[PDB]
Design an enzyme around this catalytic site. Structure first.
Site, PDB file in Angstrom:
ATOM      1  N   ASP A  73      -7.551   8.371  -7.383  1.00 11.28           N
ATOM      2  CA  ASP A  73      -6.562   8.641  -6.348  1.00 11.28           C
ATOM      3  C   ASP A  73      -6.266  10.126  -6.319  1.00 11.28           C
ATOM      4  OD1 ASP A  73      -6.399   5.837  -6.202  1.00 11.28           O
ATOM      5  OD2 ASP A  73      -4.658   5.797  -7.502  1.00 11.28           O
ATOM      6  N   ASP A 104      -4.968   0.629   9.447  1.00  9.65           N
ATOM      7  CA  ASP A 104      -5.925  -0.416   9.032  1.00  9.65           C
ATOM      8  C   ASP A 104      -5.474  -1.892   9.252  1.00  9.65           C
ATOM      9  OD1 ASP A 104      -4.239  -0.807   6.720  1.00  9.65           O
ATOM     10  OD2 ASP A 104      -5.906  -0.716   5.290  1.00  9.65           O
ATOM     11  N   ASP A 107     -10.691   0.350 -11.702  1.00  8.35           N
ATOM     12  CA  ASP A 107     -12.023   0.052 -11.158  1.00  8.35           C
ATOM     13  C   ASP A 107     -13.015   1.208 -11.213  1.00  8.35           C
ATOM     14  OD1 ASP A 107     -10.688   1.407  -8.921  1.00  8.35           O
ATOM     15  OD2 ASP A 107     -12.234   0.595  -7.627  1.00  8.35           O
ATOM     16  N   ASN A 110      -8.208   5.072 -11.416  1.00  4.99           N
ATOM     17  CA  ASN A 110      -7.923   3.633 -11.237  1.00  4.99           C
ATOM     18  C   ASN A 110      -8.780   2.826 -12.194  1.00  4.99           C
ATOM     19  OD1 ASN A 110      -6.132   3.970  -8.969  1.00  4.99           O
ATOM     20  ND2 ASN A 110      -7.941   4.355  -7.708  1.00  4.99           N
ATOM     21  N   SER A 150     -12.461   4.125  -9.631  1.00  6.11           N
ATOM     22  CA  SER A 150     -12.163   5.023  -8.515  1.00  6.11           C
ATOM     23  C   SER A 150     -11.064   5.989  -8.951  1.00  6.11           C
ATOM     24  CB  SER A 150     -11.747   4.246  -7.265  1.00  6.11           C
ATOM     25  OG  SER A 150     -10.541   3.517  -7.433  1.00  6.11           O
ATOM     26  N   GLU A 201       4.148   8.624  -5.508  1.00  4.97           N
ATOM     27  CA  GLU A 201       2.687   8.659  -5.630  1.00  4.97           C
ATOM     28  C   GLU A 201       2.264   9.858  -6.461  1.00  4.97           C
ATOM     29  OE1 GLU A 201       0.388   6.661  -5.267  1.00  4.97           O
ATOM     30  OE2 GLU A 201       0.979   5.128  -3.806  1.00  4.97           O
ATOM     31  N   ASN A 222      -7.490   7.282  -2.162  1.00  2.00           N
ATOM     32  CA  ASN A 222      -8.316   6.652  -3.167  1.00  2.00           C
ATOM     33  C   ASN A 222      -9.794   6.724  -2.775  1.00  2.00           C
ATOM     34  OD1 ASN A 222      -9.130   4.106  -4.939  1.00  2.00           O
ATOM     35  ND2 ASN A 222      -9.492   3.601  -2.751  1.00  2.00           N
TER      36      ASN A 222
END
Ligand SMILES: [Cl-]
Ligand SMILES: [Pt+2]
Ligand SMILES: [Pt+2]
EC number: 3.2.1.17
Length: 129
Positions: free
Chosen positions: A52, A101, A48, A46, A50, A35, A59
């Site tokens: 990280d 989650d 979109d 990202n 966003s 990562e 994120n």
């Protein structure tokens, strides 16, 4: 801060990630390797819009507030800047809500593609824990 492999393992273990929801320490370290390459300061944009953040690349769409991700959540109730501390407490504490989650460590694409189903305990091999 760029951690050492066994340094990071120890810190994560000290924070209760070893076998958290069944994911042995090796998974968490391997996740961090692929990562952020162990770097607390790692940031990555990202597609979109966003970003990280940190050691486990948490994120901004769901998990933290970075003040610039339109229509996102701050489910861990922190600034994304807090995930870039040399203290991993918030990265770990937020990862604990992420991993609960229902998707598990599949939330991390790096874990899914590079760690899932590998001898992950190689990543803790040799460490004084
Ligand atoms: Cl701490
Ligand atoms: Pt803790
Ligand atoms: Pt700590």
């Amino acid at each position: 801060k760029v951690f050492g492999r066994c340094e990071l393992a120890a810190a994560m273990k000290r924070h209760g990630l070893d076998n958290y929801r069944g994911y042995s320490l090796g998974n968490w370290v391997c996740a961090a390797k692929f990562e952020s390459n162990f770097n607390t300061q790692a940031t990555n944009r990202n597609t979109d819009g966003s970003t990280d953040y940190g050691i486990l690349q948490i994120n901004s769409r769901w998990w933290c507030n970075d003040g610039r991700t339109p229509g996102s959540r701050n489910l861990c109730n922190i600034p994304c800047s807090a995930l870039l501390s040399s203290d991993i407490t918030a990265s770990v504490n937020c990862a604990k809500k992420i991993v609960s989650d229902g998707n598990g460590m599949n939330a991390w694409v790096a874990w899914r593609n590079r760690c899932k189903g590998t001898d992950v305990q190689a990543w803790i091999r040799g460490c004084r824990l």
